[model samples]
Target: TRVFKKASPNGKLTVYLGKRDFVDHIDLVEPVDGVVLVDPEYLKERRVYVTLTCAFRYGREDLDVLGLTFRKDLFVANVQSFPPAPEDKKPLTRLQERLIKKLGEHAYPFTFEIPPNLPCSVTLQPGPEDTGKACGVDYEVKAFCAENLEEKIHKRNSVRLVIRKVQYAPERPGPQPTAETTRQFLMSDKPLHLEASLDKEIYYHGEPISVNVHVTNNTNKTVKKIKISVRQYADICLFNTAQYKCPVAMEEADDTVAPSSTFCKVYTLTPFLANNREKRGLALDGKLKHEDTNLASSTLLREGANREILGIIVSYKVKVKLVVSSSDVAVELPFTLMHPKDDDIVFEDFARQRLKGM
Candidate 1:
């Protein structure tokens, strides 16, 4: 289980999962959490109850041949009643009396974790002319009440706290990376040299990647076209080796070069998670494939703790290909993607000191 800490929400019956407007990252082994504040009078008179759940939903906007809609609860990672059986069913303590004066006497806190193997959060992007939450992996925390234990909870009496399980590129530095290659044909005496480089060796999600390409065609054949693609590589190390490439962004150049000529071009590629909602394996905006996951930031790999034991290693590369006749010559420059590490907040101190009198 993970723990989350956030400020209380300002609603009649609200659930707060950590601080307001807080962005929770995926690296934490424990869950992030918040408190639920309900009306003390309503709880005393109605005998209300609360539960915390972590559920993933996969929904589509299409109908089957039989006219049935397609929406599935891909998984319910965990579910537990707040103030479990041994806790008297009242999740408040004498220390929380101050909150009773402000919000109500009925304040409950809950926590849940994102499954280790769960996919990152994702939502299908609606077209400009369309609307709705189509297909994707989404998660939320809900607190509701009913007159009796067997009754179904309705919208009018429930609250949903939306939380995102995200990944961030680590704040670190690496070598300036570049890739160079030279290719020659059977009949062509001169060879062609191609070089590609990036401004940096690491990037965070939603950041633009700049690629600089330099080409020199000493061959008799002309350079017809050039293609650049930024691809994400996923390696599932469990079974026999499995790897696939998802091209999140790409660009093409049609500039032709004569024999013994040179050309240079710069392309700026921004692969935002919001723009790739429909891409399979892209983990757009924290969404991932139903059974597998983490664009919460690319799966990071470490020495001695490689994929064989860790299960996945996510890395990225810039591929530049030069079209010469029917065959193409290409070079790939590998780079890193990670979440930036944040300063420690000494939460224990805050929890004990700051909330002591409140």
Candidate 2:
């Protein structure tokens, strides 16, 4: 659990999250409380409300022209925490009664609900040279008091609590994923065989992935280079379906292999958000204008063959490309990237501050 507080000269507000973190396929629940320790006269004139807000910010320092970068509020949930009431109406709960008895009659309580389909929290890892805000997905809860419904919220009257929506990888399913294929050119009788496999079927953020590849060239073609990449895929289902794919991490070997030769190699790729600072197009890796972040883990799905439900689906794949002098052939193997069950990965503090000033 996490608690946050903000104080004004007239009163103070406190927000509590049921847990420090939440996960996909789960509901987000939290409570809000407000107490007026002094200035009871001013507190009686205002109403307080609590809100759950989520936003997406996309930044690009490369823009030399005058223009606004991409930014949008993805979701908002607001509920009144304290409605203006007569002084005769007394506090109801024990905590509220205790608060009112000691702090005067301005105590109130409220609750919030965050749905399961909301996007998971994310922040771009900053590059070494970045000094501006990069892209990010952020969530926060705010409590504020105002004289009227139309009044704007200000720091002196509001408290904000930062939170995260995370995902955890399930136990290893039986039969690790592996795929292989053989292809032959129409003009040549010989064929090329390629096999690709991962050390495990599931991986966590900040962990290294080992790709074991075996290639046999029985054709007349010469293999000029070998390339391996970790790709992130997103499928968004709306009235019109949309999909996105980006290479989060990649490595290439220029070593050559002649005909009738076979080679086996293991490539180690660590796709942390910290390492991909300068890569511009790898947006899926959580590269913002200031920070670099690892790609988002695959989204969760329910078991069974249910078809009535639909939502965003995130997935990962390892792609191996053989650069044959005549043509390039590639094989893709799908896998899962998710947070470990033990929760050992340390979330950075920047994400906390990033949502505060926003």
Candidate 3:
């Protein structure tokens, strides 16, 4: 059963959208797109325009610098005008062809192609006390009826919908992670004590993560407990790198370790929303907010030169701390938390069954 949809404010012109989330399949994005069904006469004088944009809002409204809050409403793609300037010989998509036949000559399709450089969709988690929209990059499709493609925001005649350009969990193959942290008594260069590592280079959401910790108590000190914690850190670069972290899972092993000995144990941690629901300011992947959200997927920056840009960066790490007599020796091993779901397949499965991909 298909749900009802949206239109221009007047109700005379409507925009029936497609899949809400346009995935970055790597092969290509789900092709940022939509279909427009407008009154035939409205097209005679005015051209219907589809403009795509990536909006970034990074600061509070009160947090202004030189009269500008840190927001980038960048025009990522060119605006598409249809009936497409009759001097043009371009063709419409299959939906445009089919729509014109079935809907009786008044439907148009437009797709947006991204440029070489742009940021992926990611949100900076807003704390419970935080007000207004959180920091993040979000994409949207805007269509309107105007004489020219460029026009002021048209509340009455335009349709705007939010879309997310996100990366799905890629296959597990990247970097080998190894880490170490040391503690000294009253003397400097006394000893190196604790090291930690993850079993896999990457892990899927809801999967239990195993942290292999090697604790070597080389110095003359008693280790009270092996404290383990998994943390998700977000970097919002709008203001000189706003670095913050939240703990996802943790444990305190009360078993004592004697001096001049080595102890090894595998700690299991599962990071999920059920544990952190009451916790605020935890980032979830950019939200259409329809599905239950999980911890924000690790942001993927594949290459430099043409690919890398800044705004919001998210990562996860396993922290192992050895509570010693005098000092705590803590080591962090960074790892990837990816979603088990293949985003494109979900789009395919949902769109295949329903005319609209929810």
Identify the candidate with maximal lDDT: 3
Per-residue alpha-carbon lDDT of model 2 for 1-358, expressed as tens digits?
1233345433455443324455554443223233333333555877677776776554542212134275456678776567734532434434444444544455455444566655666543334444433444566676777777569887776766555666665556666567788989987779899888888887888888898888899988889999999886655333223455667789998968788999889898877655644444333423243332346777656666222123335677889989988568778888878765311222122232321113
Indicate the worst ten consecutive residues by lDDT in candidate 1. 349-358
Rank candidates, lDDT, best first.
3, 2, 1
Better by TM-score, candidate 3 or 1: 3
> Across residues 1-358, which tens digit of lDDT does each residue of candidate 3 receive?
1212367788756665445555564456556545667776755777777767786666542112234356766555555555755543345555445444545656666667665246666666567675534667767666778876565657887876666665655665655688987677776555747888888877877999888888877777788888888899877766435666789898888967787888888889998866875675666654423354567778766645422244677789888888776568788888888765511111112221212123
Question: Candidate 2 or 3, higher TM-score?
Answer: 3
Q: How many pairs of residues in model 1 come into backbone collision? A: 25
Which candidate's TM-score is highest?
3
Q: How close is candidate 3 to the true structure, as a TM-score?
A: 0.76
Q: Write the per-residue lDDT of candidate 1 for residues 82-123, one digit (tens) a residue.
A: 334454433443323333344444655544545544544443
Off by over 4 Å in 3: 1-5, 25-27, 60-68, 85-104, 128-133, 151-153, 174-176, 181-192, 218-221, 239-241, 259-261, 287-292, 302-309, 342-358
Query: What is the lDDT of every predicted structure here?
Result: 0.54, 0.60, 0.66
